Amino acid sequence: ATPHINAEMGDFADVVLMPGDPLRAKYIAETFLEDAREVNNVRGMLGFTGTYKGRKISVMGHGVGIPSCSIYTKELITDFGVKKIIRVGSCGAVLPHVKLRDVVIGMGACTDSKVNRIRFKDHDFAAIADFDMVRNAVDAAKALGIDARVGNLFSADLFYSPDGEMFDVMEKYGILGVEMEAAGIYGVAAEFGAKALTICTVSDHIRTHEQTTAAERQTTFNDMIKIALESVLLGDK
Amino acid sequence: ATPHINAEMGDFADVVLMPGDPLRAKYIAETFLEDAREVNNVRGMLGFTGTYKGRKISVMGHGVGIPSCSIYTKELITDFGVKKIIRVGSCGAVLPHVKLRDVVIGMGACTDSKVNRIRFKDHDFAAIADFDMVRNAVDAAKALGIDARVGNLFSADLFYSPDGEMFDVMEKYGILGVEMEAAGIYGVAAEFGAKALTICTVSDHIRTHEQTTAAERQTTFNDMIKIALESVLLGDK
Amino acid sequence: ATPHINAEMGDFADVVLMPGDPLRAKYIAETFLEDAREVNNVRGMLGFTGTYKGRKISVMGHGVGIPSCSIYTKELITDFGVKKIIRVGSCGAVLPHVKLRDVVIGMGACTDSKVNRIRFKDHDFAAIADFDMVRNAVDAAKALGIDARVGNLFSADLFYSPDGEMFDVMEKYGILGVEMEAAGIYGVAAEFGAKALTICTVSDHIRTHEQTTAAERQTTFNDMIKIALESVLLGDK
Amino acid sequence: ATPHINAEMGDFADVVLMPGDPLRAKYIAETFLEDAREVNNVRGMLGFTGTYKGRKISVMGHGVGIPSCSIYTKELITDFGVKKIIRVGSCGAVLPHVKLRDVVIGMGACTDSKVNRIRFKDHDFAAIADFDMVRNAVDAAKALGIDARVGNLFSADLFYSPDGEMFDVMEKYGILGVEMEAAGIYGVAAEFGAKALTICTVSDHIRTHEQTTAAERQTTFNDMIKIALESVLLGDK
Amino acid sequence: ATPHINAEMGDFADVVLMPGDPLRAKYIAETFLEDAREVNNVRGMLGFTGTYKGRKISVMGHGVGIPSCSIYTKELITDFGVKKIIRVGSCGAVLPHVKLRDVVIGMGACTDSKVNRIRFKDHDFAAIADFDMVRNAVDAAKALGIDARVGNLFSADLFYSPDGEMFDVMEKYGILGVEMEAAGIYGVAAEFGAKALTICTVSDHIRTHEQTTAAERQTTFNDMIKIALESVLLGDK
Amino acid sequence: ATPHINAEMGDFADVVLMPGDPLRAKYIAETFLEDAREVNNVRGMLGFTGTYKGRKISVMGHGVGIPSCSIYTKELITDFGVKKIIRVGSCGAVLPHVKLRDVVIGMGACTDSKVNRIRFKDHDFAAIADFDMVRNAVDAAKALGIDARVGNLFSADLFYSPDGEMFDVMEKYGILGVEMEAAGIYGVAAEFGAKALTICTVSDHIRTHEQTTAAERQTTFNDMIKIALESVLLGDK
Numbered sequence A, B, C, D, E, F: 001a002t003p004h005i006n007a008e009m010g011d012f013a014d015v016v017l018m019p020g021d022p023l024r025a026k027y028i029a030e031t032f033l034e035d036a037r038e039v040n041n042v043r044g045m046l047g048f049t050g051t052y053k054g055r056k057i058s059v060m061g062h063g064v065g066i067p068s069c070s071i072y073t074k075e076l077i078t079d080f081g082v083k084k085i086i087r088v089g090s091c092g093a094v095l096p097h098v099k100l101r102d103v104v105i106g107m108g109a110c111t112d113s114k115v116n117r118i119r120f121k122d123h124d125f126a127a128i129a130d131f132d133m134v135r136n137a138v139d140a141a142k143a144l145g146i147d148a149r150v151g152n153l154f155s156a157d158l159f160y161s162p163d164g165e166m167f168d169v170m171e172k173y174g175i176l177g178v179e180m181e182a183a184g185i186y187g188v189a190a191e192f193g194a195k196a197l198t199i200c201t202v203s204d205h206i207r208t209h210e211q212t213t214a215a216e217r218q219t220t221f222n223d224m225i226k227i228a229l230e231s232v233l234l235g236d237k
Ligand SMILES: Cc1ncnc2c1ncn2[C@@H]1O[C@H]([C@@H](C)O)[C@@H](O)[C@H]1O
Pocket: A020, A089, A090, A091, A092, A156, A158, A159, A160, A178, A179, A180, A203, A204
């Protein structure tokens, strides 16, 4: 047991899927996992462990922001022997060619946070995902007929930033998606010798705004979870 | 309605109590508020509005970390006309004379986060609470026979920091409590012209560790909520 | 005796009022103190000790700037047993509602300096005043029929700054006054375990632009001094 | 022609391999390219163009350091229509498991330099390689029976650094190799919309300490070059 | 007249000697200047203008610290036509081979202050003295048989620095003397278009701990002043 | 022999002229040195040692950028007994009154590089040249009838800087020339205990856009070399 996870070694699988909103953990468990059992309820962060095609897998939300996901990823890594962490969620896009519902795989993650500088002697730490995990995700997406975009994400500390101009800079340097965790999770993974990957679906633009329906989000979201889950299987093979 | 709060102007009172763990919102509403009604459920962040001695008051969790509470405090301030925000929770202490269960009022908040430097041209912004709110809290504590400690809090981005030595520095400069939101909330309050205060009860030491029981936490926690609630009334008078 | 103070333990009271201008120290000693004796003249930084309504009090200039006042307050605290320091000066206003002759009390002080970062491992140290001294001042002002404003001051290293943009930032984040020592004095107080407070009268506006020089301006300066002196009396009771 | 390159559009292929040492460029052109013509000699920074298995390819030294390679890659991209740059060099190891003759592929590059901060408004820019080029290299290596390691490289400004402590930090966070250009080249590629990749062979260890100079060392260097060349072929198909 | 100088264009000469101590200016005007006339008394920062060997010369203290001397040097330059500023003060030595009473000419000035970074977009501005003034001072010294070292000074913001290790770094890089103004005077001179030079007398050793010694003060101080005054005449010629 | 210099103690003179361009070193050795002998060819960084007016002198390129020249200057100083390093290069002007072919002596060197901050605990290290070498160069120039400005240079890390505004700041502060090595050479000289000086020829104007002009290159370049060589003789005397 740990400060934020009321469970014992063995309760979580070596691979954990982590959605932003906690509510999605229960949904992932009953929609994609078989024989799911509850393994955590502290602070309302429901955790579940089950199997996907015989493969043991766990799922539990990580809350919003670098400080929150840094806590859970760390405890999962050092207290429950977790080897791989896959964050699944959404992001905003700044590039005109990146459309709503596109799938983005964060090979790297920029940030305006100071956590990595605190870890790296105030130098530039390239917060990156595990390469094999990125390629597994891309191939799994391909197998499902999905066109996945791979590149840099930007993990913001402030959803409501004072410097609106930074989005122009992000666009100029090819940032594919804007979210709030990747750089933090990649930092933790690097600090404790584990693997991580962030997968996001474009939720909106930071220019204008396309209009759709939850019907065009349901299975697009399901597509993302499918990608994450199938990518783990390719990783094992 | 906003991205994270599914409610309309008027749903929240001008004063909002915000506990770390969401679960505590429901508890505060049924234990201290009368005629409470549910006003938000997005992402599981239950919000409630009711009255305390005829005084309209709302309560809703703010999640863990500066990035999370920065989102909610901002939306409450700019979209729901909230005037005062009081964070209630716990903290770790580094000073030998600060004991478990002591009540700490954050007049100021240090941090290792970069959000305030991003707002203040990379200069030092003194993240402070509203003075009247601090004095109301102190007096209310006094009226309940509580001995309140007032000073600096430290809002950490990383609960599991690599630099263990920083705690020695915190002790040397008199930091009363270590938590993860104050500096963020004070920053937002300053950015959008509102008032904020953080009140914490010492949850543990960062040296050794005292041992008690949940029985000595129940009403100590209730004491804190009482302080927060009575402080609002003194503020109105 | 210390490098910049040619006196001996006992020559100063445990409470020291400190204006920026040494000539202002003599003015204060001649106007409010009974039987005031000069206790220091090194570098012309006049220091005086006398009694206010029976209480032993000292007053001494601290020069212009954080580097200057940091030396004097530090020597007063570590070598003359001074336990409280109250800076009494003038500041420039940035907020339109802050008028001339308004009394400002800095419970917090933002800064341009790098001194607190050197002290706080390059993180954000919230330079705050001692809570009881702030409250004593508010009450003394109230007793005198004066509405004091409590909030953030901005301590600048450059009276003639090359970036006029900061003033808008200061205004946006609610800085009540701009001066040049508070953040330095509060840093020292925390480093050596003492208590400090900065009280200022607005002598110049930068929002509407305006100076001051009249009987009314000098009446407000004297009120500020009475607030400082009366606040020490309340601190004792 | 540009300031440092005396050639004309067309003299270079759209793909350029770049070793640090110009003499190494001539070596590469003489060893793997057919009908290689010298296309630049300004400052002795030898550039060559020829064909590898029918494909037009160029190779040219980039000098030592981010400042140096930043100039050449930038001119190649904005004035010679170069669309891909593959740095082929050597790096020092920090991790005990990273042995001599191991082929390292930098999907990411940490740095000491301030160049990306100047570009990214002082925030953390994750300098990453183009995903397809990384995958092409992994597959080409596989086809050659070589196990390549993919991860972070560290680009240093000081080959002789005054702080030997960084090496432990680099090891702790899993840096695979230490060199001096990757972060610079990846910054340029993102700024001007091109694609880049850095491939290195470990020529020195800092964990166990050791150099190299043998037939086996030179065999591994040539393997790295074949990996680079074969990877461009796969990129076309 | 300016905010800190009650004088009129013409009251000051085009060259001004500035010691930290206001009382030293008075001593200089009475000892080396003829027909000396006091031109400023604001804040007790005594200012004098007289003649030396027929040359019109002024002398005025600048107070302690970068923020103080910056104000005065700025006002002299923009409102009184001052072209040359020569600081004549005391400094602490960190090098073993540098002894007390030694005269150091600061051709450069290091600092832990943020004033120059604020002026120079957060980059490294090399705060240097005017070459001819340095050359003049070295020559005037030879003609007086006085020894003088030319190199870097370090202008600290904290006389009571909590960072003792920094003195070792200063020693390693050859800092000849530690004072508190040079970097500021040079920053101001470059910003407002004037020329400046700092000449210091080693008053003590930061290592051996021992301020000014015996009556050797006045004598060595007089050497510095003589060197400063003579160097002004070489300049005119 | 060192990692980048295949020579032996004794092959280099105690003073070394270093241009950026390796081919320029060759030109200098053939044009100004007698009995010139090549002592290094590693990476094509040609090095020569001959005699000038009987004085043993060496000349070797240092490559482009701070990271490159730092390596070479360091190796020369610690393994070949080099006491004096004189960089002879080209620079870009930002001041209108500074024209092409002008000779500038860098007594100081600003920079946007982080190398000196890494050496100087993140503070401001004023990168300066050895006073006597500067004085020698100014004198040798007068004796040659050549004009020469003495002041600050700016050593940039990015020749293709995305920050155009910075040139205005450089102009405001009197930067005489923009190059890419000075701050590094001076940092190294101070770290490894040697003396250095940078003499530059204004090759173009960053504003007017126009590199070296006509055959005026060789002539002005020869003036710089002559000045450098003669200054070495003044030094010996
Ligand atoms: C402006 C901005 N900054 C940071 N993250 C942002 C953002 N806009 C959107 N996001 C990310 O997308 C999620 C929403 C849109 O579902 C959010 O949960 C979030 O992960």
